[PDB]
């Protein structure tokens with residue numbers, strides 16, 4: 168498994184636990200309603216160690232860029248400013264966020280041809296599945 172295999176545009180086809188995850192983050196009602204109803208695309212590109220992830224929907228588009236292995240300031244879709252590091256490890260992209268004494272992990276892996284995106288904060292989990300599109 169390589170980071171290249173994750174590249175391209177992906178469309179959300181299933182979500183479980185996302186509202187619970189947003190509540191654990193303390194996201195307010197407007198962004199939680201938007202997160203319930205959006206069906207974003209995720210666009211992953213990677214040029215060696217330069218990674219970009221763009222989340223695109225009619226309601227909100229966000230994007231970040233980083234160098235794998237390097238700490239950077241991420242503005243999240245809910246507006247937190249986290250210290251983030253992304254790495255490709257054990258056949259998954261792993262994105263670790265730390266802020267104000269809190270931490271959350273997001274993983275992205277290929278399973279049976281789908282992109283499986285998992286999030287956790289304090290044992291509150293979500294799984295979002297995306298299918299490859301053109």
Ligand SMILES: CCOC(=O)c1c(NC(=O)C2=C(C(=O)O)CCC2)sc2c1CCCC2
Nearest residue numbers: 198201202205226227244245273284286295
């Ligand atoms: C963490 C806060 O996340 C959000 O506020 C958020 C999304 N987040 C995601 O889609 C996320 C993931 C994913 O499936 O790529 C993994 C990290 C969060 S998608 C979206 C919103 C809020 C606005 C509408 C669409």
Ligand SMILES: [Cl-]
Nearest residue numbers: 205206224225
């Ligand atoms: Cl949408």
